[PDB]
Amino acid sequence: VDQRTRDALQRSVQLAIEITTNSQEAAAKHEAQRLEQEARGRLERQKILD
Amino acid sequence: LAPRNKTRVVSYRVPHNAAVQVYDYREKRARVVFGPELVSLGPEEQFTVLSLSAGRPKRPHARRALCLLLGPDFFTDVITIETADHARLQLQLAYNWHFEVNDRKDPQETAKLFSVPDFVGDACKAIASRVRGAVASVTFDDFHKNSARIIRTAVFGFRDQAVFPQNGLVVSSVDVQSVEPVDQRTRDALQRSVQLAIEITTNSQEAAAKHEAQRLEQEARGRLERQKILD
Amino acid sequence: LAPRNKTRVVSYRVPHNAAVQVYDYREKRARVVFGPELVSLGPEEQFTVLSLSAGRPKRPHARRALCLLLGPDFFTDVITIETADHARLQLQLAYNWHFEVNDRKDPQETAKLFSVPDFVGDACKAIASRVRGAVASVTFDDFHKNSA
C-alpha cells in the first residue's frame, strides 16, 4: 500500500543486476588472465628452444 | 436492419467446432447440439447465452456468445508478476486449449460443458496464479535465462496437459512471447549489461592478436639470430 | 460492380493447392473439395470462411479466405528476442510449410484441416516462443556466430 515501501524494493532490484554484471566481468577477467598466462608459458618455452 | 418476422420459426446455424444449449421450458427437456447444424426453437425453447471474457488483460463480461467454442484454439493474456529480487516484469502468454468430449450423446457429460459461466476468465486466472507463485520464489537472473522452463513447470505439474475437471477444458500448451520490465530504470540497468559484453569480446580479440604478434616476432628473431652465427 | 443475380446458382472456382469446406445445412452433410475444381452451393449449403493472420509482425484477423492454402509455401515473420547479456535484437525469419494430407476421401482427416481457426498466427507464435526460449540462455557472442 505504501509508496515508500515500493521505493525500497526497486533499490533491491537495481543491485541484483549489478551482482550479475560484476560477476560476468569477473569471469571474463579470470579467463583473460588464464589466456595471457598460457600465451606467456608457450613463448617462454619457445625462446629456450630457439 | 429489417425487423424480424416474429411469427416465423426461430432458427440458428451452429458453426463448426461449436455447441449450443437449448432447454424446452414446456416439455421439460434439454439438449445440446454439436458441430455444424441448424437449430430451430420451439415456442418455449430458449438459448443459453454465454457472457464470456475477452480483452487485453482479459476483462470480464466483454463478449457474448450464443454458442460454445470447443475446437483447438488459443487465447492470449498479459500477466504482470514479480521476482524474488522485487523486480516487476509483465509477460505475454498464449494458452492452446480445447474442450474434451468423450460421448456427445451423454446428457450429463455435455451438460458439464456449460457449467462454468466463463471458462476464459477462469482459466486465464487459474494459470496466472501458478505463474505468479512459482516466479516469486525465483531470482531475476535465473528467470531471465530459464523462463521457458519456469513457466512450463509452474503450469504443468507432475505433465503434458492441464485438465480442468469441472467442464472439460484442457490447456495443452503455453507459449511465452514477450518478457520485459515494467520499470524504465530496470531497463536502463540492462543496457549497461550488454555494453560490457561487447567490450569483453573486443578486448579478447585484441589480446589474441597481440599474443600472435608476439609469437611471430619471437620466431622471426629466433631465425635471424641463428642466421647471424651461421654467417 | 454489377450486383449479382441472386436467383443464380452460386459457384466458386477453387484454386490449385487449395481446399474449401462446405456444409449442407438441410441434408445434414459435409464435404471438403480439393485442388482445382468448380464448387457450387445448394440452397442451404454455406462456405467456411477463414479469418487468417497476415501483416509484418503477423497481426491477427488481417486477411479473409474462402479456401485453405495447402501447398508448399512460406510466410515470413519479424521476431524480437533478447540474449543472456540483456542485448535486444530482432530477427527476420521464413517458415517453409505445407499441410500433410494422406487420404483426401477421409471425412475425419480432411475435417481436421479446418479445425484450427488461424494456422498462420498459431505457427508464427509457436515457433517464436522456442526461439525466444533458447536464445535467452545464450550469450550474444555465441549467438552472433552460431545463430543458424
Swiss-Prot record, chain B:
<comment type="subunit">
    <text>The vault ribonucleoprotein particle is a huge (400 A x 670 A) cage structure of 12.9 MDa. It consists of a dimer of half-vaults, with each half-vault comprising 39 identical major vault protein (MVP) chains, PARP4 and one or more vault RNAs (vRNAs). Interacts with TEP1. Interacts with PTEN and activated MAPK1. The phosphorylated protein interacts with the SH2 domains of PTPN11 and SRC. Interacts with APEX1. May interact with ZNF540.</text>
</comment>
<protein>
    <recommendedName>
        <fullName>Major vault protein</fullName>
    </recommendedName>
</protein>
<feature type="repeat" description="MVP 9">
    <location>
        <begin position="10"/>
        <end position="72"/>
    </location>
</feature>
<comment type="function">
    <text>Required for normal vault structure. Vaults are multi-subunit structures that may act as scaffolds for proteins involved in signal transduction. Vaults may also play a role in nucleo-cytoplasmic transport. Down-regulates IFNG-mediated STAT1 signaling and subsequent activation of JAK. Down-regulates SRC activity and signaling through MAP kinases.</text>
</comment>
